[PDB]
Symmetry: D2
Subunit: 431 residues, 4 copies
């Protein structure tokens, strides 16, 4: 609980709480009774009593009894079914016989898991959508804010803050595409009985799965997937990529907050938001190892791999929604310090503009000749500890082709941004 | 090398060998010169000399010099560019000036990586396609081969071998869908220069990227992605799911090969193919942790995360193609032992048919009554160590509703398969 | 909470609960005030008021306020210090000035972490000690219980159950050695102030650390270790090995519980204990990836890596203590089914004794000759579907050297156990 | 091969090459024949022929045949034994019968693995020893070089470069202790035969293992450990900690190389060494997940887990030795830029000395009063954009207790280093 505030996101944590989990299991049991009554497998009468008794089962369920019983049964569904049955019995000893009719523990657990995933995906998707919108808007606001591009953590050539923001925006848009593309394949119901054959429903199996899926508004699958878990992993893999995208952003803005750089700051000096996001960017990759090992499952119901999913999947959702929430706060209240950006550009005293000077000279001199005059000027500028502009401006060959004013233009960071504006426009359009 | 034969797949290993990597880099340099000549940035003359000198550069390149130089430069592209330039020079000192014009090391390395991924994906996709076809065909051949379904490694209720095969087939089909769905987003070119601004190409940047993408037949992206790596991770994540699917299959067939079960065997008694596949199902999840940590990259070119990708991505492809190749061999030459399957069904002496007997009795007796007669019969059958059929057949209540012949039918494994045939038909149709 | 019962161990979970964590932080603050009063840095008077106010601070602390404040400060220590100070103030506005004198957040957090580790290690060590004792005792009880040894999951040659138990016992003993060997190096105090220089204590720093360590009965280190985390990883690495040892045991006993093998059973048929232990054996390796990435920490206090430890370390302890607790239950109430063991030995109808027959014949025949008679007999026995003893006993060359009674001895599983009894005695002695 | 130069270390890579592996296997076979001849199990004559034929077997072995055969057998030992036998046969058809007498594949593979580990550990230990020596020497050289301590990547209070170096030195010393402490437990021989019972050696088993261990100068274990793998994991876990220690150092020196900080540089501006070390600090944690999953092994010889070790263990050694080698180069030729260190200390214009000013005033004013005068001065200094010294020096209360010269002393970074010199001396002594 003390850490929930630091790393997770309140709504996604609630969706995965013990109380919500049991709520979703109740929902799965109700849909099952309804789907069966609707096709004749059980009397409409029983379904109605179950549907009504359910509305308050959550308040009548003993969570201490449930936890203790879980350790002995090996899963929550078994003791949960006992309790729900006893609850429906105290309302009609007869409807009680139809509670959990034909299902096995994993049907209810996997279905509640998919119901949880459906709801937490909606929240995560909306967070990504706001992050995208906000990054696009800031990219536009600062598309002309010049600053240094850094490679291997060393100043290299100028870029604009808007270009970093456009790069992040486009990454969020690819995440939005990934989320939409997996929904149909992944949000499906689970109902197959003990060995996934629906044997106790005899020849009514396919009819009942179809109506069960429909009641919950989930997809239906061709065959039971108690042992094939690609759908679970697939959902985790997309959350993993989203966490990696904001992890990269948090690495960048906290580096820009170093005392000696101070170009961008987290809204109100410690980078508290970066610390949480970077912790999630450490933890999610480790949880991915786990969710992938969980694919190796024995026959019709695994020993170990399936149990591990109950611990890893929720943690991945919670860290991702938590990391997205802190990233949004930062993208919205981000403080840009234009003076420090200008100052850090002056750090190498014009040496970073060397190649720009060389390109301006190439036409009137031949690239070989241009390269040679600039390299000798850099040596001189370093020996005299002067700005490269001061040295190049007193070189004869050069005065032959450029006035002082043309030289001042050649040395402006803005004059060497290549096609950065085309790239920013290109990402503003894919929107 | 000795292990390559055990875990990898020959063609995918070649695509990622030092020699192929340098080949793809050469290909990237040629496309760059051609795209530039085609839009005016460099003389068509130079492009033609480079394109021709390239055809044999691979044979002229010194790989020992290259490896030694790589350790000092920090990447292969830098010493590779020197060498290729020297090679083009000995053919025309003038065309040599245009080699690697405007690109930075990462453009050539990421582009060669995507070219490699394109080729290895084609091979992996074709392996999945054959695995799918073969699983569908075997599923049909054995849709009626009865055997025990096992949960928590304990016999539970009958299923058919064809149902396990249909479950695997449908998993392969979802993999085929995943592979097709990422191609457009992932197989794109990389050309952005030092800080991804294409500054040295000035206002010709967007025009050149477009023609470079086209020359290589790759997609073009809105902005440079030197630091945003979701496309790399995404490709690894799909390979990871495929390896998890065959890992699950290898766990199953090797369990079916245990001396005491002996229901299915690897083609010619050790499960050599399972050992390799299960090793890949251990290694790939670990490599996933690595590829996901690699998303956290500093600014415009990372220190560490990017270097790690060069080691992990190829290993994931190689283990996946290797695991697919051994799985295909097994799916094709799989030996089914129907007698052992029949025998293991007799293992509990009819106790696994208890619920089937109870369902047959429910109508003529009321489920409560049916449950009670069957439970007392199980106790008796265990006490007398007799087959449950022998005990139930001499119970009065029962003889009242069933002749010996109807009892023999109720006890046949085939009579309690629920909707397994509908599920097998459903997966044969999605095809 | 519902899952705590399934995977963790009650006492270790309490040591890592929010309430115990704050308790240990209080303990760290008290020791600090006492150590300082004892060397003159603060008045003995203040230390006494703090020590007394502390006895009930836990009941006066607002945990909701604390959680909310934590999300904003980035760690629990900061809001905790405010609260504890306010608590000491309402008892003496003057002693309150000396609360948390000279320490930084990480000193209190790392010290409370080591106090927690000290207490959970004592519990884990005692669990390993009982597992060791129990395995040694069972090894002795069944040192002569013959059963099949299995390689690549295939029957190979006879072993005894006692030999598997001795192998597990010796592994537990190496764990006991590992635990004892790291205590001195790992259970040390943390007190270094903001940048680990104890600057606000001026020239009293070393004197105060020495007395602080002593008050808590922890080791003292030569230099501050806010950024060097090998001690944390080292503790996790040993817990990781212990979880791997019981993971291996759970894989084995659940395989022995398969319906068709049924040689050993979990005490009261699903392997519920194996499912939990195997889930921990999936999760701990993934958490190890995380704890190892956490070593890469920036300068004097990291951004991300340190925060991640707060989530991973406790989970590793909790899963290990949980896995040990279920393993102990199984080692103590383990049900051995000697008849099934005897029966599975008869599974290949004497074929597994082929090499034993060959060794008995080698002396009177020459190994070449012995190998050739046995191989032809195996072919015949398989063709006639007879026990190998029936075939070999009617082979002339053979009757020439052995009576029927000597042949019956050569075919007893017990006669081909090599030095298994020496190995079991050897592990009973290292005890 | 091209990457070997970037990430690994030449000698450790050779120890794990195919050629060295087969060399060590030959060595294991020779020791086995010798140990057996020495106790009577095989004729001294055969042992001598094998020992002599071995001296050149490596040159006679067909590596292509070996690789092809390996993929079919499932391990290298099987086809290797065939070849070595054929080699010994062409020298004496009789000695050939005793090649690999009584051993199983895993005995030779695990023994060659431990022989490799023994040799690579010697190299890694020596690298750590040199890193330790060099760090201690540099710590001494710069114990007085003042620079900023940084927390959460923000300047905090002064420290000395020597203190960072002492912290690293002490971490290397704990690694030296860890390496020495595991040798006895981990460097042991493996000889147990098919199911670890040495059944084919009958009652000579224990005698032969003892002499086999002795011939190779390895420890002997109480029982066979084909399935218990804690010794392998333990070796990987220590290499993992070493890689994490230099990973932390590489993060620090590359941050100190940022253009705007420029306090320390890699010897000859890109941090090429940091890039490799940080890639190993990403990859090793992932490989740890794998080596830990490999503990879960089936019965007497696993399917999958054991095979995976052949790929992970060597990679961990190679990355660790590679990371150590680059770290040593940097520790030895490290360039310290004292002026930039001095300059970055002036970055906040005295604000970082605020607490030092407050401690100097506390005695003559009361901590409350001191805190209040300093906080108002910081506000003023920020409003006027002046150095805090300029503001505090014109505050009356203050002039009352300090002359200008005493104020200049209070503001020197060196005057607020707490017990850093005691810590540096403490680590120089543990040496």
């Amino acid at each position: 609980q003390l850490y929930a505030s630091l790393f997770y996101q309140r709504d996604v944590t609630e969706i995965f709480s013990d109380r919500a989990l049991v709520s979703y299991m109740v929902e799965a049991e109700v849909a099952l009774a309804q789907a069966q009554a609707q096709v004749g497998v059980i009397p409409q009468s029983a379904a109605t009593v179950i549907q009504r008794a359910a509305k308050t089962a959550i308040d009548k369920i003993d969570f201490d009894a449930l936890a203790t019983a879980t350790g002995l049964a090996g899963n929550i569904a078994i003791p949960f079914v006992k309790q729900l049955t006893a609850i429906v019995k105290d309302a009609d000893e007869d409807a009680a016989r139809y509670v959990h009719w034909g299902a096995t523990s994993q049907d209810i657990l996997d279905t509640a898991c998919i119901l949880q995933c459906r709801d937490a995906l909606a929240i995560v998707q909306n967070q990504v959508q706001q992050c995208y919108e906000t990054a696009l808007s800031q990219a536009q606001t600062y598309r002309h804010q010049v600053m240094m591009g850094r490679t291997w953590l060393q100043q290299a050539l100028p870029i604009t803050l808007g270009h970093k923001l456009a790069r992040w925006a486009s990454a969020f848009k690819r995440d939005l595409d990934r989320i939409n593309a997996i929904k149909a394949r992944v949000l499906v119901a689970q109902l197959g009985g003990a060995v996934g054959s629906l044997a106790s429903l005899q020849d009514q199996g396919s009819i009942v799965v179809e109506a069960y899926a429909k009641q919950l508004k989930l997809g239906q699958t061709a065959c039971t997937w108690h042992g094939e878990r690609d759908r679970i992993v697939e959902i985790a893999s997309v959350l993993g990529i989203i966490t990696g995208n904001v992890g990269k952003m948090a690495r960048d803005w906290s580096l820009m907050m170093q005392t000696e750089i101070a170009e961008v700051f987290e809204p109100t000096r410690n980078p508290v938001a970066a610390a949480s996001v970077l912790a999630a960017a450490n933890r999610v990759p480790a949880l991915m190892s786990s969710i992938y090992q969980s694919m190796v499952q024995e026959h019709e119901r695994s020993l170990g791999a399936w149990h591990a999913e109950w611990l890893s999947l929720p943690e991945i959702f919670q860290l991702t929604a938590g990391a997205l929430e802190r990233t949004l706060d930062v993208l919205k209240g981000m403080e840009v310090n234009a003076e420090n950006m200008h100052q850090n550009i002056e750090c190498t005293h014009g040496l970073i503009m060397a190649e720009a000077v060389m390109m301006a000279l190439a036409p009137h001199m031949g690239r070989l000749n241009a390269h040679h005059v600039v390299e000798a000027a850099c040596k001189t500028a370093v020996a005299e500890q002067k700005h490269l502009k001061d040295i190049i401006s007193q070189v004869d060959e050069v005065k032959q082709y450029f006035n002082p004013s043309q030289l001042d233009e050649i040395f402006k960071p803005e004059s060497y941004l290549g096609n950065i504006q085309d790239q920013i426009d290109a990402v503003l359009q894919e929107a």
